[PDB]
Structure 1
Amino acid sequence: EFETIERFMDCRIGRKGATGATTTIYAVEADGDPNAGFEKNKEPGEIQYLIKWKGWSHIHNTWETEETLKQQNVRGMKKLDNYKKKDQETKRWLKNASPEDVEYYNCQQELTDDLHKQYQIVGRIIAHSNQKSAAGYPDYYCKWQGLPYSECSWEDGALISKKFQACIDEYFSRKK
């Protein structure tokens, strides 16, 4: 019925309207980053968030504003309050911080950042649909890098060939 929020993945200041379906990685690749030429300079922006939608997989992460979360009558809005609360607590005990703490925080906080971006490439395909679409695509059973095998999904076969045809090739070639 209504969307739900599972995790808040990152935060950012970005172009006004760089929120919504058009901000997923496979739209930005197939269409273009609405948030393209942004230095935070040259252009006033907005606080946008990176949402991991309940039900859907880490590839459908879209960026939204507080407004669009409310405008979309989405569930999980308390999660929005906590993410903002613990962000203020984290900025607090890093204002009085030795330079080597900022070294740690920025080194670390950037490892999790990669690890998160890897949750979107497909580690191996595992199955496919009997049914095909009008356009002639099965749907695929993807395993995602970093995420365990219980983080697998039935993914659009038209969708994943655009970036992982090679992973589709090796599924079929490990039969004959």
Structure 2
Amino acid sequence: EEEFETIERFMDCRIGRKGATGATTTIYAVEADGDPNAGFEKKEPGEIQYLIKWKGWSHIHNTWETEETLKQQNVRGMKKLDNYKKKDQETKRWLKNASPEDVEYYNCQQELTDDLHKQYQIVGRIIAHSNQKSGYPDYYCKWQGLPYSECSWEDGALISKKFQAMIDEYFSRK
């Protein structure tokens, strides 16, 4: 009965251009067609958007979404939206009177943290390849900064467009 998608974790929130969310927001889509939030200023409306890590999908499939888009798609695990907001309002709050020292420590940590999350969308190594095919076999990828328990199967055409090197090395391994 129908297909849902479910929120695993909230990766980030920002103010972005109306409509700049969902499947045209994945970095592989952004790299391919551009960023729907590219322009965005102030000049036009604002919309709080949440970057989403989906259950069953690797980080490259993260997309920006809004509280509205989530409900239009029947996405599950929304109780997780209430906690995130709460937490976020709380820290933007704290950020109001934070020591100059504390704020600095805050910025250094989020910088580092943000770098790690960026790695998750990078193929650190191709470890297998299906032989079904539609000519592009699927590849089992090992993600940078993540355990092997996070490896995932990914469309070959898509992974090759950016991690060709990683798949040529895989084959040189025989």
Q: State the shift of 1:101 in Å.
A: 1.0
TM-score (norm. length: structure 2): 0.95
Q: Which whole-Å CA distance do the structure 2 matches of 1:27 and 1:72 have between them?
A: 20
- Segments of structure 1 that go 5 or more residues without pairing to the other structure are none
Q: Relative to structure 2, which stretch is displaced further, 138-147 or 104-113?
A: 104-113
Q: Which whole-Å CA distance do the structure 1 matches of 2:95 and 2:24 have between them?
A: 34
TM-score (norm. length: structure 1): 0.94
Deviation by residue 1:98-123 (Cα, 9 ceiling, x = unmatched): 11111111111111111101100000
Seq. identity, %: 99
Q: Relative to structure 2, which stretch is displaced further, 102-111 or 90-99?
A: 90-99
Deviation by residue 1:113-143 (Cα, 9 ceiling, x = unmatched): 111011000000000011111xx10000000
* Counterpart residue number, 1:131: 132
Q: State the shift of 1:88 in Å.
A: 1.7
Q: Relative to structure 2, which stretch is displaced further, 104-113 or 20-29?
A: 104-113
Number of residue pairs the alignment of both structures matches: 172
Residues 96-135 of structure 1: pairs in structure 2 closer than 5 A: 96-133=97-134
* Counterpart residue number, 2:13: 11
Residues 1-176 of structure 1: pairs in structure 2 closer than 5 A: 1-40=3-42, 42-133=43-134, 136-174=135-173, 176=174
Q: Which whole-Å CA distance do the structure 1 matches of 2:40 and 2:156 have between them?
A: 33
Deviation by residue 1:82-103 (Cα, 9 ceiling, x = unmatched): 0001112222323221111111
Q: Which whole-Å CA distance do the structure 1 matches of 2:147 and 2:56 have between them?
A: 16
Q: Which whole-Å CA distance do the structure 2 matches of 1:118 and 1:173 have between them?
A: 24
- Segments of structure 2 that go 5 or more residues without pairing to the other structure are none
CA RMSD of aligned residues (A): 1.0
SS at match of 1:59: helix
Q: Which whole-Å CA distance do the structure 1 matches of 2:139 and 2:148 have between them?
A: 14
Q: Which whole-Å CA distance do the structure 2 matches of 1:147 and 1:130 have between them?
A: 25
The 4+ residue runs of structure 1 with deviation greater than 6 A are none
